Enzyme design. Structure first.
Site, short mmCIF file in Angstrom:
data_model
loop_
_atom_site.label_atom_id
_atom_site.label_comp_id
_atom_site.label_asym_id
_atom_site.label_seq_id
_atom_site.Cartn_x
_atom_site.Cartn_y
_atom_site.Cartn_z
N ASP A 85 -38.53 40.93 20.96
CA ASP A 85 -37.90 41.46 19.74
C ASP A 85 -37.66 40.39 18.66
O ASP A 85 -36.70 39.64 18.73
CB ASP A 85 -36.57 42.14 20.09
N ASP A 110 -40.30 42.88 12.37
CA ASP A 110 -39.45 43.29 13.52
C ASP A 110 -40.30 43.94 14.63
O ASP A 110 -40.54 45.16 14.61
CB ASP A 110 -38.33 44.23 13.01
#
Ligand SMILES: CCNc1cc(C(=O)N[C@@H](Cc2ccccc2)[C@H](O)CNCc2cccc(C(F)(F)F)c2)cc(N2CCCCS2(=O)=O)c1
Ligand SMILES: CCNc1cc(C(=O)N[C@@H](Cc2ccccc2)[C@H](O)CNCc2cccc(C(F)(F)F)c2)cc(N2CCCCS2(=O)=O)c1
Length: 374
Positions: free
Chosen positions: A32, A217
């Protein structure tokens, strides 16, 4: 050895194999770039096949402090501690790192995802409970001789790809790497200067594209856009695809669109170009996105006479998110050392016989405006 070290399922994130503790406990960990906490399931949960057992680790140290993290989707709470962490198919390195042991969660873990925790690769500024909690990659760089850079090649139910730590793998991309500055070290914040759909400028003040920030992201599925940009984009996509009419619910992601297997009419959907700020004044480059990216396939054996897709563009009140569907088919270099993000066409880039994903520049504008929102 690091090539093809990522797996996933569509819409459910990409993960890498890791170990925590000593003796090592193997866990799959979602990569992430959109957060900064390393956290692992540390108690039984309906959707966890395995979890971190602190009592079995000789090297565990409790930090005597709780932590709570609410994402856009999902939230968890747990207990802070430190332990040894390794990446078996990454650099042959092991580091002592902060770990949030998750003991309570809400809509975080995903049924059938095959991951049990999350590796937040962004900067300390957005770590919880505060920026004194050193993120994993910072610990890795400090404790080992690893160069301060990593790269992600996310490929498009099962998906795969590669995370290269400490370097750039030239076998994973073609053409040139184009770099955009990391505007602020918190999220991987970047600046979008122009958006085109079907070759037509959206024609907004460029600050709108970055209200109130734009980030890269890997942990978010969709392209997320500020309301005003989302509404203009949907209008433009609808117009370009107007040969077919879909229910309002499709555009809101409430509903699938389905076609007989092998007959998806890709050509009726437009290409989307995001122009990212260059390293030089008023210069930019563009990454071009195909509908094979923003119409995310939804695998379901019950619907399998058909190919079915979810619209992977959605509205945000927290700024732009270039999520996994945007990153897929690009080789994305997180050059922390030089405070820049590089993009190139990846070895697994999306294309058909008419069109292809692309990274192209340079582009010049005479407009003197700063596109950053603050
Ligand atoms: C991979 C799981 N699918 C999705 C995951 C997330 C998301 O919030 N991802 C966070 C990690 C995560 C991974 C797997 C399950 C749950 C969460 C990612 O960290 C968010 N990055 C921005 C952010 C936002 C708020 C706080 C933080 C903090 F910094 F961590 F606090 C970071 C959002 C998301 N979207 C909202 C639904 C509708 C579809 S979506 O794509 O638009 C779909
Ligand atoms: C903060 C570092 N924990 C630890 C570091 C190492 C260690 O020797 N690491 C080397 C690689 C390695 C990987 C897996 C098993 C064994 C070794 C690494 O090559 C050493 N690098 C130099 C070094 C040594 C000590 C501290 C540091 C530091 F950078 F300052 F932190 C660097 C081992 C370790 N333990 C293993 C479980 C059992 C007990 S242990 O304490 O020996 C804890």
């Amino acid at each position: 050895e690091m090539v093809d070290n990522l797996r996933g399922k569509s819409g459910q994130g990409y993960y890498v194999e890791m170990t925590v503790g000593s003796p090592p406990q193997t866990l799959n960990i979602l990569v992430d770039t959109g957060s900064s906490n390393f956290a692992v399931g540390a108690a039984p949960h309906p959707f966890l096949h395995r979890y971190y057992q602190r009592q079995l680790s000789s090297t565990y140290r409790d930090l005597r402090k709780g932590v709570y993290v609410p994402y856009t989707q999902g939230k968890w709470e747990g207990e802070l501690g430190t332990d040894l962490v390794s990446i078996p198919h990454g650099p042959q390195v092991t580091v002592r790192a902060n770990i949030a042991a998750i003991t309570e969660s809400d809509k975080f873990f995903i049924q059938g995802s095959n991951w049990e925790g999350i590796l937040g690769l962004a900067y300390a500024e957005i770590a919880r409970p505060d920026d004194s909690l050193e993120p994993f990659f910072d610990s890795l760089v400090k404790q080992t001789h690893v160069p301060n850079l990593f790269s992600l090649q996310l490929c498009g139910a099962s998906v795969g790809g590669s995370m290269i730590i400490g370097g750039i793998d030239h076998s994973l991309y073609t053409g040139s790497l184009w770099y955009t500055p990391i505007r602020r070290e918190w999220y991987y914040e970047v600046i979008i200067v122009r958006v085109e759909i079907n070759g037509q400028d959206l024609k907004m003040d460029c600050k709108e594209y970055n209200y109130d920030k734009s980030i890269v992201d890997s942990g978010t599925t969709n392209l997320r856009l500020p309301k005003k940009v989302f509404e203009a984009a949907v209008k433009s996509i609808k117009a370009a695809s107007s040969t077919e009419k879909f229910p309002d619910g499709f555009w809101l992601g409430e509903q699938l669109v389905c076609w007989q297997a092998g007959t998806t009419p890709w050509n009726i959907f437009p290409v989307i170009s995001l122009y990212l700020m260059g390293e030089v004044t008023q210069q930019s480059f563009r990454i071009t996105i195909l509908p094979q990216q923003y119409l995310r396939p939804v695998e379901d054996v019950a619907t399998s006479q058909d190919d079915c897709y979810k619209f992977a563009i959605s509205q945000s009140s927290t700024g732009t998110v270039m999520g996994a569907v945007i990153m897929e088919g690009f080789y994305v270099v997180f050059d922390r050392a030089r405070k820049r993000i590089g993009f190139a066409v990846s070895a697994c880039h999306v294309h058909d016989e008419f069109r292809t994903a692309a990274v192209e520049g340079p582009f010049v504008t005479l407009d003197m405006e700063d596109c950053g929102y603050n």
